[PDB]
Paper text:
[name] is a porin composed of a 19-strand β-barrel and an N-terminal α-helix ([name]-N) attached to the inside of the pore. In addition to its role in mitochondrial metabolite transport, [name] has also been implicated as a key player in programmed cell death. Here, using cryo-EM and NMR we show that [name] oligomerization or confinement in small lipid nanodiscs triggers the exposure of its N-terminal α-helix ([name]-N) which becomes available for partner protein binding. Biochemical assays demonstrate that [name]-N exhibits a pro-apoptotic function by promoting pore formation of the executor Bcl2 protein Bak via neutralization of BclxL.
To ensure that the [name]-N peptide remains stably bound to BclxL, we produced a single-chain construct where [name]-N (1–26) is fused to the C-terminus of BclxLΔLT (lacking its flexible loop and the transmembrane helix after residue 209). This construct allowed for crystal formation of suitable quality for a high-resolution structure determination by X-ray diffraction. The general binding mode between BclxL and [name]-N is reminiscent of BH3 peptides, e.g., as seen in the BclxL-Bak-BH3 complex. However, the binding site of [name]-N is shifted toward the periphery of the BclxL binding groove yet overlapping with the BH3 site. The C-terminal tail of [name]-N loosely binds to BclxL in an extended conformation, which is not seen for BH3 peptides. In our X-ray structure, [name]-N forms an amphipathic helix with the side chains of Leu10, Ser13, Asp16, Val17, and Phe18 facing the BclxL binding groove. To validate the structural model of the complex, we performed alanine scanning experiments where every individual residue in the binding region of [name]-N was mutated to alanine, followed by NMR-detected affinity measurements with each peptide. These experiments showed a strong impact of residues that participate in binding to BclxL, with the L10A mutation having the biggest impact (~20-fold reduction in affinity). Leu10 is the only large hydrophobic residue in [name]-N that is establishing a hydrophobic interaction with the BH3 binding groove in BclxL, thus markedly contributing to the overall binding affinity.
Numbering used by the authors:
A (entry chain B): 570 to 587
B (entry chain A): 2 to 28, 80 to 198
């Protein structure tokens, strides 16, 4: 799953709504 | 949108040169400031997190068959929690890493496509946030060295 793969590559791309 | 294409091509050209793809390839002041700030931010990002985007084309199956909407789908995961300047920098750095890797793996055809994909993604997905958050002149104020 591309989406899963992507999520791995960008694990550190998290944060808030704001 | 033309300025978005130019920013993408400036950044990717910079990253390819910096890695020494001057030889895999046959060889305003307001916008200059934007380009320089983005180059420096992308360098900073890469110095901070350079394990982050290794072996991309393999993990993401980016090939000469890949269509824009697969790139879009991947990048959407980067902005899953919303857009900010740090993730926009990450986006540019990702694209740069994809370009370098593509050249390294003898898939040079991808460089012009990645640049088109980034410009589209910027215009359609990121520009609406940018134009609510001060535009690139505000990015310069935040991340420009000077």
């Amino acid at each position: 799953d591309l989406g899963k793969s992507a999520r791995d590559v960008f694990t550190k791309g998290y944060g808030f709504g704001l």
